[PDB]
């Protein structure tokens, strides 16, 4: 008696909020934060879908989603550390040299 539509709507709201944070912020740290928000929203959507059908598949896909999320957070934060080490700023618009 909790609708699947409401859970999917909540996950979609969090996904588009994470996408908005990923786009509008020039800071690479806030871009990684937005990426974490989007992948957590997708994992929440999988949990909602699995709970609607009464299957463990949603939680299995949640586990795979957070394994991916942890690994990409590690890789992105290492890249952010290298960028801050060799540029002393996190402005992602500064790294735009290759073009055309």
């Amino acid at each position: 008696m909790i609708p699947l539509q409401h859970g999917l709507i909540l996950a979609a709201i969090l996904f588009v909020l994470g996408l908005t944070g990923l786009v509008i912020r020039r800071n690479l740290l806030f871009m990684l934060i937005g990426l974490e928000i989007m992948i957590n929203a997708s994992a929440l959507a999988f949990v909602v879908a699995g709970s609607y059908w009464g299957q463990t598949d949603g939680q299995v896909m949640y586990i795979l989603a957070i394994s991916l999320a942890a690994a990409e957070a590690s890789i992105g934060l290492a890249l952010l550390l290298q960028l801050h080490r060799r540029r002393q700023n996190l402005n992602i618009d500064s790294v735009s040299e290759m073009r055309g």
């Binding site: 786009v23 871009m31 992602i92 735009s96 073009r99």
Partner: protein, 54 residues
């Protein structure tokens, strides 16, 4: 009047159009990561809207 070979230029018109279209399309490759994310989301909107319409 014909010594400039007008039919040759008329058939070379697609080459000029291709050059202009390529130069116009290369403006999207500005190298900005935020624009790349914005273009991916714009394409997501376009694909979703096209699937909803059809």
């Amino acid at each position: 009047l014909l010594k400039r070979d007008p039919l040759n230029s008329m058939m070379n018109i697609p080459a000029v159009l291709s050059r202009f279209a390529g130069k116009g399309l290369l403006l999207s490759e500005n190298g900005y990561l935020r624009w790349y994310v914005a273009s991916m989301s714009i394409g997501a909107v376009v694909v979703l809207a096209l699937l909803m319409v059809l």
